[PDB]
Amino acid sequence: NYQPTPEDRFTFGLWTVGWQGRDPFGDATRRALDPVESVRRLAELGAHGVTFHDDDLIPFGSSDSEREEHVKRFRQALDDTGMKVPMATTNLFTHPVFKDGGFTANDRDVRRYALRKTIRNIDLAVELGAETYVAWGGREGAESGGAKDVRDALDRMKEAFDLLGEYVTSQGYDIRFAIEPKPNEPRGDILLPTVGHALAFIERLERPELYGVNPEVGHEQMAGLNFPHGIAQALWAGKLFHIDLNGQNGIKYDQDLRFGAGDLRAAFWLVDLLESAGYSGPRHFDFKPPRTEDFDGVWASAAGCMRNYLILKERAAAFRADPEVQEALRASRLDELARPTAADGLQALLDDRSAFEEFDVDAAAARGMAFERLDQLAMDHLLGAR
Amino acid sequence: NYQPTPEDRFTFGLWTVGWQGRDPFGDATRRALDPVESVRRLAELGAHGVTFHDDDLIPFGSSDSEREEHVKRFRQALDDTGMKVPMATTNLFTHPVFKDGGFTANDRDVRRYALRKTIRNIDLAVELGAETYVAWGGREGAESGGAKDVRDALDRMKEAFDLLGEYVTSQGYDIRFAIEPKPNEPRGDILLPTVGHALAFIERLERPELYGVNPEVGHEQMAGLNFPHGIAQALWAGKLFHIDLNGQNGIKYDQDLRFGAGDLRAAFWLVDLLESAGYSGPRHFDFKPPRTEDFDGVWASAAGCMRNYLILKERAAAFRADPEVQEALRASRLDELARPTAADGLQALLDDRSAFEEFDVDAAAARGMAFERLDQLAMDHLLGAR
Amino acid sequence: NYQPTPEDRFTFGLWTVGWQGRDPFGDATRRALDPVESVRRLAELGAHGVTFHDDDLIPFGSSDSEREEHVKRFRQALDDTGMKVPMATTNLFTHPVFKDGGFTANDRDVRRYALRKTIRNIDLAVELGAETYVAWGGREGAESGGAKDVRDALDRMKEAFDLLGEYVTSQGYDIRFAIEPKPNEPRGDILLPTVGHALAFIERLERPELYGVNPEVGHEQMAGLNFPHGIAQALWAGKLFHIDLNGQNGIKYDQDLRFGAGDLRAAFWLVDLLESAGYSGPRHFDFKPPRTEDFDGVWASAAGCMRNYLILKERAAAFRADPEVQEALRASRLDELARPTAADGLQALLDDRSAFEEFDVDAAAARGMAFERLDQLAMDHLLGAR
Amino acid sequence: NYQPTPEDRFTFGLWTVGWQGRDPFGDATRRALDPVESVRRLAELGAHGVTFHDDDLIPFGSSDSEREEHVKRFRQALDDTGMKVPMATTNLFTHPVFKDGGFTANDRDVRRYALRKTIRNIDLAVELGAETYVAWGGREGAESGGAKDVRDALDRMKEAFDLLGEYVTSQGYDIRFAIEPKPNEPRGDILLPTVGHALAFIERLERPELYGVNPEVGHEQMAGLNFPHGIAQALWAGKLFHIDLNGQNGIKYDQDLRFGAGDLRAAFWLVDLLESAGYSGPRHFDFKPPRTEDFDGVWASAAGCMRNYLILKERAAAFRADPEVQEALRASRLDELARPTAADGLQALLDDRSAFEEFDVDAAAARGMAFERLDQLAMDHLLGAR
Secondary structure, three states: OOOOOHHHOEEEEHHHHOOOOOEOOEOOOOOOOOHHHHHHHHHHHOOOEEEEEHHHHOOOOOOHHHHHHHHHHHHHHHHHHOOEEEEEEOOOOOOHHHOOOOOOOOOHHHHHHHHHHHHHHHHHHHHHOOOEEEEOOOOOEEOOOOOOOHHHHHHHHHHHHHHHHHHHHHHOOOOEEEEOOOOOOOOOEEOOOOHHHHHHHHOOOOOHHHEEEOOEHHHHHOOOOOHHHHHHHHHHHOOEOOOEEOEOOOOOOOOOEOEOEOOHHHHHHHHHHHHHHOOOOOEEEOOOOOOOOOHHHHHHHHHHHHHHHHHHHHHHHHHHHOHHHHHHHHHOOOOHHHOOOOOOOHHHHHHOHHHOOOOOHHHHHOOOOOHHHHHHHHHHHHOOOO | OOOOOHHHOEEEEHHHHOOOOOEOOEOOOOOOOOHHHHHHHHHHOOOOEEEEEHHHHOOOOOOHHHHHHHHHHHHHHHHHHOOEOOEEEOOOOOOHHHOOOOOOOOOHHHHHHHHHHHHHHHHHHHHOOOOEEEEOOOOOEEOOOOOOOHHHHHHHHHHHHHHHHHHHHHHOOOOEEEEOOOOOOOOOEEOOOOHHHHHHHHOOOOOHHHEEEOOEHHHHHOOOOOHHHHHHHHHHOOOEOOOEEOEOOOOOOOOOEOEOEOOHHHHHHHHHHHHHHOOOOOEEEOOOOOOOOOHHHHHHHHHHHHHHHHHHHHHHHHHHHOHHHHHHHHHOOHHHHOOOOOOOOHHHHHOOHHHOOOOOHHHHHOOOOOHHHHHHHHHHHHHOOO | OOOOOHHHOEEEEHHHHOOOOOEOOEOOOOOOOOHHHHHHHHHHHOOOEEEEEHHHHOOOOOOHHHHHHHHHHHHHHHHHHOOEEEEEEOOOOOOHHHOOOOOOOOOHHHHHHHHHHHHHHHHHHHHHOOOEEEEOOOOOEEOOOOOOOHHHHHHHHHHHHHHHHHHHHHHOOOOEEEEOOOOOOOOOEEOOOOHHHHHHHHOOOOOHHHEEEOOEHHHHHOOOOOHHHHHHHHHHHOOEOOOEEOEOOOOOOOOOEOEOEOOHHHHHHHHHHHHHHOOOOOEEEOOOOOOOOOHHHHHHHHHHHHHHHHHHHHHHHHHHHOHHHHHHHHHOOOOHHHOOOOOOOHHHHHHOHHHOOOOOHHHHHOOOOOHHHHHHHHHHHHOOOO | OOOOOHHHOEEEEHHHHOOOOOEOOEOOOOOOOOHHHHHHHHHHOOOOEEEEEHHHHOOOOOOHHHHHHHHHHHHHHHHHHOOEOOEEEOOOOOOHHHOOOOOOOOOHHHHHHHHHHHHHHHHHHHHOOOOEEEEOOOOOEEOOOOOOOHHHHHHHHHHHHHHHHHHHHHHOOOOEEEEOOOOOOOOOEEOOOOHHHHHHHHOOOOOHHHEEEOOEHHHHHOOOOOHHHHHHHHHHOOOEOOOEEOEOOOOOOOOOEOEOEOOHHHHHHHHHHHHHHOOOOOEEEOOOOOOOOOHHHHHHHHHHHHHHHHHHHHHHHHHHHOHHHHHHHHHOOHHHHOOOOOOOOHHHHHOOHHHOOOOOHHHHHOOOOOHHHHHHHHHHHHHOOO
């Protein structure tokens, strides 16, 4: 019954199950978790792998020798379990030095430090086998309009990502970058606030082929946007390098609920899209077990993430396989949407009286779309009520 | 006393001051305006020009004699007043035939009709002098997840815009296209919901140089986004072809308040940005005088749009000219933000011990950013307490 | 399979299935529906009854004779089907005379007219057997801060509802009032914007026992609030006289989706609460079949409303009946929440060292709440995956 | 030059200027402030007084010697400066023991401990001169629908507040309670989420005269609500015991910006309302200097709160005094709104043919409301263009 296996490619950040529960108005409720324990317990739950910020694995300010010992212990646990590390990222948001940003800090010396800290961890990520290096610019932005010249900040952002691309190209690394957009929190407004803005920015990088997006369910929903629609545009662009799964109740603080909570119908359509499109990347959960929970609740919440994905996968597959649903899709002309509008070309369209002078507007306007019957078939499938 | 004149390039849609007050819960409160009267009244208020949807000028279904008569009357008003027509657009949203979209309707015959209706109005727009042709895909989208395959819809949208670019290129027209993003309303979710999504889409068109964005204040605010930040990204990309100005109180239905209402501070930072950057396009008001108003109130509301822009322009200019503000900008290191992070190059950065091995993290972290003093100077200037 | 029956007390407004599809940016897509047809078709679907605004049943401006004929036809259809009319309301929002409100219009003559129009329809509602008279003040409010003195408007609101209470008391009618709060749309902000504000206002009426609330799913979700939580406070207060069911995707324009769409998990917890608490009033659907639909889609959407309520009722009943769920509720101490905190009294609490001086804060802080396991049992039940 | 003085009754929480900058994504950026220093600095800026949570003054877990020493130092600072303490509150949200609430924790022993912690601090508040005791139930609520039975929780909340009212009555204290509503954060949904819900709850307490509200600008705006409208309802009910002033950009995480930031127009209408109505309580700033700031920025931010209130007070006074505004208010019939609708009584209204049979609906509907001219006069005054 909806048991995950490592072939499902479910992954978790060390900082997810390891979140000690410190929140905007509260102290930690759980003791710290050894990454070695997280690797072992996630393996037992059926996960494929784990991910990390540099500072999750190596305490900030560690000597080279302490750093080697921390990585060695972690690698031993990976070797013992067969767990993978498909993605890594840099923490450029917790330390006070990054209070005005890393790559777009107004202070130039901070921008240079942020790049050096990142480059060091790209090397570590490559040693551990990561295929994707995520950048979440949580401190890039402003609370007030005068504090940040956004055109200059975008220049600095581009410069930073261009330098990082030069680094991985010069080193011959087979790792690619994924930009994680977020609209706000912790800054009043964050730069590159949605999947759209990030995709647009990537097209102006010197080596755009090296960069994609890492969209997160909750982040897009914090702007009230349709997450499956945004994922569709990322897939259409060839840029869905990674994805972050969790739950969110619309427009409020970043909740990081387990996947399936929040907007359940959006989670269904998301899984339908990922599976139909053949997305082959990690299904990464960037969530936080609520601080009400003890460690039994931590592992229950992590298990729930994977369970809900697998239930939704089954229901979406049943929906698509149902001949009654296929009939409803045809009745609603979803198949016709895939036909080119004018493969006959511009001149033929202009010459086609059936497209204007002889187009029966009122007859076309009278055609029902049959979308409600289609959506109720989807609801029936989601709820197992067919 | 903040009197607008045609040099200010303020423009209005016929459908703005001409809105009869119908809403989904309410019947019209004002009689219809003759476009000729709107042109004359707007000219008397100091406007530079007007804009139109095809259906605002030419009643839908008009014979070619009626269409000719309507255009001649409108042209005569333009000739009498000296009013310009810098922009036009197609109504692909009011008539029931467009209830599932124009360019991305599931029905192919509707997609072709939408293109032919647009092409006809591009010709008229060019005749009347428009430099920009706006596309607002208000019916492109869905209420339910199964109703629209967004990857197929993006293919159809690209095909449509590619054909339009072929048309203008083949005719030798100088006009360019501006895509108007909106996140929702009237569809549950609209395709290309933000400036970012539209900018990203444009980069995948066959002739991207022919396309930019027409962002609207209220649209981006309906997603909770920072409108000046989005305009900055459009300017950074070279894609701010046109702009729609109005007011909105954050995340709720599309209010179309007069410019300056809604988020007043955001309006200040917007005007500062447009004026600083040297934006030279129309300052177009896409707003609706509330239906509480008679026609005296319609013209007061239109005059208020321009008045508020001019007051804000003065305050932003005073802010930037103030020596105390120039000092505060230096204190907050806005000058450092404009400097390249690493013009010495990647290898020099990697070899620079001051950027990592010898970087004093705690000394850097102790530096205040002085953003609050800067913002209070901005507040003082906005409110005329400076 | 989830077939509704009239004993389920499902009701629909004439204006729901009869919505012709005119929306903020679009003309009607469907012809008008005869109320007699709506009564017959809703009866065939298993509905219990219908509801009406005065102007839905009797065209505004009808003579007494036309009014009698319209009501007679409608009553004949009710008599032929056994359908009931449990609720009625006044349209004080469509006609331009109400553009600044009915009961709180700034113009005093309009306020008096609004009351007379309402009183006439209370008489009709009583003739048709309505137990609840709903008041939705959709035009009560403002777009700008100077337009409406809210303290004076609340005085006028109270005066109006007090007069209506005097009327029903003097006539000896066994009908009660239900105030429908909404936060915005069509006004920029509406007076009494949530269930809370309406409950608070009712307590200051002269005859509070005559007044309750008619909360609507989407209305509370347009403020981002938790609809089941608000319903719980209404039930706690003894004030849930009626309820309006539909769907809404969080904070945007009022979508009026069919019940079950929008926030599906919130719909589950709502049905769980209504059924557990023993709510015995109508389950009224105030929804609009989307304008994409023909009349087959209208009736499908209406059927879907009832179907989704019944599926959710089954899943919530299964959840509560599951001994594993009951065990999880006890593990999370939901039963302990029902114990009085200090039925021993204030003095005993102050004297109880176990409540302060000997309270082991760290032992209590270490107790997990087990809420995630409980919520995953709820998810499993909702999706039929137990 | 808008200098605050103690006559203005501006107050600040120790936790405001004392916020060290920790957020869920970030470590502290400022060292801890001695409350004695905060009292002295706030006095130098012109503040009237300070407020505190128990835990801000007395480190949690302090012995009675340490508690005594801390209170004496604080009192000495109050005596030295003349600063008052008009309000105090209990911290029932930071410590992990409160992770499921204080008064509505599922565990009864926690509910009793929360009450005892509150009662102890009521005694201290009264000793230091507080007239208002605030309760912000930041942990009362849930992330999931099964975790909290809201009807039982409201019973427990009423029981707690009833006991507190018995305590103050039994001791003969003059202090009154003010409930601070908030819709979410740190819980997914908080109980009593808005001013309306809190006002409604108070009416069901045993001694309702002892309880009012402490609304906070940002809290109501986090639900998209109109804060001046909510304050008007609290004033109408006689329940505005205290008020918390800050800034917020609509629906997103709790930003706690300085007052005047966020929604500037709403701040103008708020100050107009408080001053017009003769509100005589503290003007309390519950804000956080952003973590980008050093201590010079902390004091600049605090000074800016008061400066912005005073500028707005001047502009609102100028608006109301302007003869042109008095004319515009008459043109918009704000005077008619203050007149009773039907002081002649129900029977006279029913018998008045001018209110119905002879009411000229279309003549009434033709009247403009002149709200746009009125609002532009308000804008002109706010911006000092008048």
